[PDB]
C-alpha cells in the first residue's frame, strides 16, 4: 500500500529510546517517529535522502544520495575516448600526465595535477586523452558555474562536484582557468569574491580532505596561474605544476600532421616548412591553417589540399 | 533398507531447522509491516510555559503556537527551550524530548581528536609545543583561559594536519568548520549553525573547534558594503559575539585557520577573540632535514637514497613539499621500480621539487 | 543559455558587439574585483572552446 | 466551450492540487507525485530507478523537471 512516491520529501536525522528517530523534512519540518519499518539504523544517520510519506511524515524509504544536485549543468562526459595521437608534441607532459595520473592510479601520492599554458592546443583534449587513457571519470568543469549568486553555492557545487564525482571515482576532474576561482586576493576584503575564493578554499579543503585517493584526480588548466599555494602544489592537493609550452615546429609538424591528417591532400606538403613558417601555434592554428587551406583548396578547386594551400592558410593572416 | 532414517531425518533436520529461519523474517518484517501504522509526530522546543498546560512553543518547523500539554507530560519538566514532540492536528505535545541538531559530522564536522599526533609532523615543533601549552594544558591547570588560536602559512604542511595532531593530543572532540556552508543560501542560519557548533560542543566539551581558512565567513570584508556581506559580518560577528561575548571555551576550544593572517578582521585578531596568531614558517634546512627524515624516510628507502644532500637541495619546502620530494622521487621510484626509494629517484625530484617553486 | 539555445538555434550566429564590454585580456584580477567579469570571458572562453559546433553555430 | 474544454485541461492540472517552466508544482500524489520542485517548497526528483509516467510524469499541466 504505502509504496511509493516520486519522489518523497526527504529529511535528515538526529536520534537513531534506541528505537527513536526525529527527522526534518524537505519541507523543513521536524517530526518524531518511532523508527519506521523500511529503514535501518545504519541507513539512518543525519543528512540523508529518505522516502517519507509526505502526509504521515512516516519515512517510507531510505534514499541513496544520487540526485543530490549534480548541478546538472556540471558536464560529465564519461571517460571519452581520445588518444595521445590527438595533438602531438606534448609527450613531455604526456609522460607527466601518466606520471601524475596513470601511475598514481595503478600502484602504491598526488590527487591531482596543475596545467598551465594556453589551451586550444587540445589541453582539453589532453584531459580528454587521459579521459580515455587512465579510464577515470572525466569531469569537464567550468568554474563560471562554481561562480554563483548563492553564498558558497560554489562550495556546495564544489562539494556537489566533489561527492558525486567521488562515486564515479576513479575520476579526473578537469578545471579550466582555475584563476577564475584562483584568486583569494590579499586581504580581509576577500568576501568581495568569497565564492571564487572559498570555493577554492572549499576545493583546497577537499583537496585537503584526502591524500591517497587516485579515484579523485584533479586537473586544472590556466593560461597562467595567478596565486600560488602549496595546496596548489601538494601531494594530495594539486601536486604537479604542468607546463603546456606552445609547441615546437616539428611538434607543430607533428600536430599539423593530425590536423592535415583527415584532410584530402596531394602532398605538395612539407610540414616542417609550414611548421617552420608557423610559430608556437597551439594545435588549432595549424588546424586553422588546415581549415583555411581547405577552403582555399576548394577556392583552388582542389579536392586534395596542397602545401601552397597550407602556405595560404598561413598566408591567411596569422599575424 | 536403513536409508530411510536419513530421508526421514534429512527432511526432518532441515525442515525442523527451516522452521524459524523463514519464521523469524515474518515477525521482523511484520513489525516493519506493523510500524507502517506508526505515524510521524511534529517537533518543537518550548519557548515557555504560559500556564501549566498553556505553552508558548515555536514549531521546530515554523512559527510560534499556543498549545497545551498532552499526557505522560510533566508540566514540571516542560520548560523553556525544551525540545518536545508535537502534534499534527491536536498540535500539542506528543512527547517530551532530549535534543541536538545539525549534521554533527557534516554541517558540523565531528571527528574525535586527530589521526596522527603532533610528533609525526614534527619540525613544526615550535608551534607543536607552543600551541599545546596554550591549548591543551590550560584545561588541566585551572591556573584567562585562552581565547583563540589562528594558524597561518601554507595549509596542510602538517598545517591542516596540525589541527588533527592538535586535536589528537587533547582528547577533545575535533570539530572542523569549512566556511560558506555556514551561510550558503540559506538566506540565514548563522548562530543556530555556530551555536550548535558552540552548544553541541559546549555540551559535548571537551571539543576542538577548527574553522577552515576563514576568509569567506571571516575577514573584514570589502567596502564593508552589502553583497550579502551583511550575512558575513553577522557570521563574522557571530563568532565575535561568542568570543567578545561572555561565551567561553569551557572544555571546547576553537582553532582558527587561515593561510594568510592579514586577511582577517582586525577585531577578530583581538584578544578576547584570539589570544594566539599561529605562524607556520617553512621548516629550516634543519626543520626540513628534520621533517625530511620524518615524512620521507618513513617511506621505504635505501640508505643509498640520499639523505642530506637532498635536504641541501631541499630549501623553502613545506612539510608536504618534503612529502612531495618523497612523492616525486616515488614517481621515479615506480619509474625505477622502487619500493625503497633510491638516490636516483630522489634528487631528480629534489630539484624538480625545487623547480616549480623555491 | 546562449550556448544552450545556440545548439537549439543551431545554424545560428552568436554575435558579440562589445567584446570590449566584458573587456579583453587583463590582470585586473590583480585588483581582484574584476575576477568574475574576467571569468565571464573565461566562461565564454571555456565553453565555446570544446563542444560547440561553429560550422553551424556561428560566433 | 474552450473554458470548459480547457477546464478539463484546467482540471487536468487541478488533480493533485496541480519554454522555461521554472517550477512544476504537480502536487502531492503519494502511493506517485511524479514531479520536480526546484523551489523552496518540497524539492523533488522522480528518479532513482526507472521512474516515468506514460505520457507525462505528473500534473500541474506542468509535467516535467
UniProtKB/Swiss-Prot annotation, chain A:
GO terms for molecular function: ATP binding; ATP hydrolysis activity; proteasome-activating activity. One of its GO terms (biological process) is positive regulation of RNA polymerase II transcription preinitiation complex assembly. Disulfide bonds: none annotated. One of its GO terms (cellular component) is nucleus. N-acetylated by NAT1. ATP binds at residues 117-124. The modification Phosphotyrosine is found at residue 84. Signal peptide: none annotated. It is found in: Cytoplasm; Nucleus. It comes from the Eukaryota. Belongs to the AAA ATPase family. The 26S proteasome is involved in the ATP-dependent degradation of ubiquitinated proteins. The regulatory (or ATPase) complex confers ATP dependency and substrate specificity to the 26S complex. This is 26S proteasome regulatory subunit 6A. It comes from Saccharomyces cerevisiae (strain ATCC 204508 / S288c) (Baker's yeast). The gene is RPT5.
UniProtKB/Swiss-Prot annotation, chain B:
One of its GO terms (cellular component) is proteasome complex. The keyword Nucleotide-binding applies. N-acetylated by NAT1. GO terms for molecular function: ATP binding; ATP hydrolysis activity; proteasome-activating activity; protein domain specific binding; ubiquitin protein ligase binding. ATP binds at residues 153-160. The 26S proteasome is involved in the ATP-dependent degradation of ubiquitinated proteins. The regulatory (or ATPase) complex confers ATP dependency and substrate specificity to the 26S complex. Belongs to the AAA ATPase family. This is 26S proteasome subunit RPT4. It comes from Saccharomyces cerevisiae (strain ATCC 204508 / S288c) (Baker's yeast).
Swiss-Prot record, chain D:
It is found in: Cytoplasm; Nucleus. The modification Phosphoserine is found at residue 53. It comes from the Eukaryota. The N-terminus is blocked. Interacts with UBR1 and CIC1. Belongs to the AAA ATPase family. Present with 105 molecules/cell in log phase SD medium. The 26S proteasome is involved in the ATP-dependent degradation of ubiquitinated proteins. The regulatory (or ATPase) complex confers ATP dependency and substrate specificity to the 26S complex. This is 26S proteasome regulatory subunit 7 homolog. It comes from Saccharomyces cerevisiae (strain ATCC 204508 / S288c) (Baker's yeast). The lineage of its organism: Eukaryota, Fungi, Dikarya, Ascomycota, Saccharomycotina.
Amino acid at each position: 500500500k504505502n509504496n511509493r512516491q516520486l519522489p518523497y520529501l526527504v529529511a535528515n536525522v538526529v536520534e537513531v529510546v534506541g528505537k527513536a528517530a526525529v527527522v526534518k523534512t524537505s519541507s523543513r519540518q521536524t517530526v518524531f517517529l518511532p523508527m519506521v519499518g523500511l529503514v535501518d539504523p545504519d541507513k539512518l544517520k543525519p543528512n540523508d535522502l529518505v522516502g517519507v510519506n509526505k502526509d504521515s511524515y512516516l519515512i517510507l524509504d531510505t534514499l541513496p544520495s544520487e540526485f543530490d544536485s549534480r548541478v546538472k549543468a556540471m558536464e560529465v562526459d564519461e571517460k571519452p575516448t581520445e588518444t595521445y595521437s590527438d595533438v602531438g608534441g606534448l609527450d613531455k607532459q604526456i609522460e607527466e600526465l601518466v606520471e601524475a595520473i596513470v601511475l598514481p592510479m595503478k600502484r602504491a601520492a598526488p590527487k591531482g595535477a596543475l596545467m598551465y599554458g594556453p589551451p586550444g592546443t587540445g589541453k582539453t583534449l589532453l584531459a580528454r586523452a587521459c579521459a580515455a587513457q587512465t579510464n577515470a571519470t572525466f569531469l569537464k568543469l567550468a568554474a563560471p558555474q562554481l561562480v554563483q549568486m548563492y553564498i558558497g553555492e560554489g562550495a556546495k557545487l564544489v562539494r556537489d562536484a566533489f561527492a558525486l564525482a567521488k562515486e564515479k571515482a576513479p575520476t579526473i576532474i578537469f578545471i579550466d582557468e582555475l584563476d577564475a576561482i584562483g584568486t583569494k586576493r590579499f586581504d580581509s576584503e576577500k568576501s568581495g569574491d568569497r565564492e571564487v575564493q572559498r570555493t577554492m578554499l572549499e576545493l583546497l579543503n577537499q583537496l585537503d580532505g584526502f591524500s591517497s585517493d587516485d579515484r579523485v584526480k584533479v586537473l586544472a588548466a590556466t593560461n597562467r596561474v595567478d596565486v600560488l599555494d602549496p595546496a596548489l602544489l601538494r601531494s594530495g592537493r594539486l601536486d604537479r605544476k604542468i607546463e603546456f609550452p606552445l609547441p615546437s615546429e616539428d611538434s607543430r609538424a607533428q600536430i599539423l600532421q593530425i590536423h592535415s591528417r583527415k584532410m584530402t591532400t596531394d602532398d605538395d606538403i612539407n610540414w616542417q616548412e609550414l611548421a617552420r613558417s608557423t610559430d608556437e601555434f597551439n594545435g588549432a592554428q595549424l588546424k586553422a591553417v588546415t581549415v583555411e587551406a581547405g577552403m582555399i583548396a576548394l577556392r583552388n578547386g582542389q579536392s586534395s589540399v596542397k602545401h601552397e594551400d597550407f602556405v595560404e592558410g598561413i598566408s591567411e593572416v596569422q599575424a | 533398507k536403513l536409508l530411510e532414517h536419513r530421508r526421514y531425518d534429512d527432511q526432518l533436520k532441515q525442515r525442523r531447522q527451516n522452521i524459524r529461519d523463514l519464521e523469524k523474517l515474518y515477525d521482523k518484517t511484520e513489525n516493519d509491516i506493523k510500524a507502517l501504522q506508526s505515524i510521524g509526530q511534529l517537533i518543537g522546543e518550548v519557548m515557555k510555559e504560559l500556564s501549566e498546560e498553556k505553552y508558548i512553543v515555536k514549531a521546530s518547523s515554523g512559527p510560534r503556537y499556543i498549545v497545551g500539554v498532552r499526557n505522560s507530560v510533566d508540566r514540571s519538566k516542560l520548560k523553556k527551550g525544551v525540545r518536545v514532540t508535537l502534534d499534527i492536528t491536536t498540535l500539542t505535545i506528543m512527547r517530551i524530548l532530549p535534543r541536538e541538531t545539525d549534521p554533527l559530522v557534516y554541517n558540523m564536522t565531528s571527528f574525535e581528536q586527530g589521526e596522527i599526533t603532533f610528533d609525526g609532523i614534527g619540525g613544526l615543533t615550535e608551534q607543536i609545543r607552543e600551541l599545546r601549552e596554550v591549548i591543551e594544558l590550560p584545561l588541566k591547570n585551572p591556573e584567562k583561559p585562552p581565547k583563540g588560536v589562528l594558524l597561518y602559512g601554507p595549509p596542510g604542511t602538517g598545517k591542516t594536519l596540525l589541527a588533527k595532531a592538535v586535536a589528537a593530543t587533547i582528547g577533545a572532540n575535533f570539530i572542523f568548520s569549512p566556511a560558506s556552508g555556514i551561510v550558503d543560501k540559506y538566506i540565514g542560519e548563522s548562530a543556530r549553525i555556530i551555536r550548535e557548533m558552540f552548544a553541541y560542543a559546549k555540551e559535548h566539551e571537551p571539543c576542538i573547534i577548527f574553522m577552515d581558512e576563514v576568509d569567506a565567513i571571516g575577514g573584514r570584508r570589502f567596502s564593508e558594503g552589502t553583497s550579502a556581506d551583511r550575512e558575513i559580518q553577522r557570521t563574522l560577528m557571530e563568532l565575535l559575539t561568542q568570543m567578545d561575548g561572555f561565551d567561553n571555551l569551557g572544555q571546547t576550544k576553537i582553532i582558527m585557520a587561515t593561510n594568510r593572517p592579514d586577511t582577517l578582521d582586525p577585531a577578530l585578531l583581538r584578544p578576547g577573540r584570539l589570544d594566539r596568531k599561529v605562524e607556520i614558517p617553512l621548516p629550516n634546512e634543519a626543520g626540513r632535514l628534520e621533517i625530511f627524515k620524518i615524512h620521507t624516510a618513513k617511506v621505504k628507502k635505501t640508505g643509498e637514497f640520499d639523505f642530506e644532500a637532498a635536504v641541501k637541495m631541499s630549501d623553502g619546502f613545506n612539510g608536504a613539499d618534503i612529502r612531495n620530494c618523497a612523492t616525486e622521487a616515488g614517481f621515479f621510484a615506480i619509474r625505477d621500480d622502487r619500493d625503497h626509494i633510491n638516490p636516483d629517484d630522489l634528487m631528480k625530484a629534489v630539484r624538480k621539487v625545487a623547480e616549480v617553486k623555491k | 543559455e546562449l550556448f544552450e539555445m545556440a545548439r537549439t538555434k543551431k545554424a545560428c550566429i552568436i554575435f558579440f558587439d562589445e567584446i570590449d564590454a566584458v573587456g579583453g585580456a587583463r590582470f585586473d584580477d590583480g585588483a581582484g574585483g574584476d575576477n568574475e567579469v574576467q571569468r565571464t570571458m573565461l566562461e565564454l572562453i571555456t565553453q565555446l572552446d570544446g563542444f560547440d559546433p561553429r560550422g553551424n553555430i556561428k560566433v | 466551450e474552450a473554458r470548459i474544454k480547457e477546464k478539463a485541461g484546467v482540471k487536468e492540472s487541478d488533480t493533485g492540487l496541480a519554454h522555461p517552466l521554472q517550477v512544476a508544482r504537480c502536487t502531492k500524489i503519494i502511493k506517485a507525485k511524479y514531479v520536480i520542485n526546484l523551489k523552496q517548497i518540497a524539492k523533488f526528483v522522480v528518479g532513482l530507478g526507472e521512474r516515468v509516467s506514460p505520457t507525462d510524469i505528473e500534473e500541474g499541466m506542468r509535467v516535467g523537471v
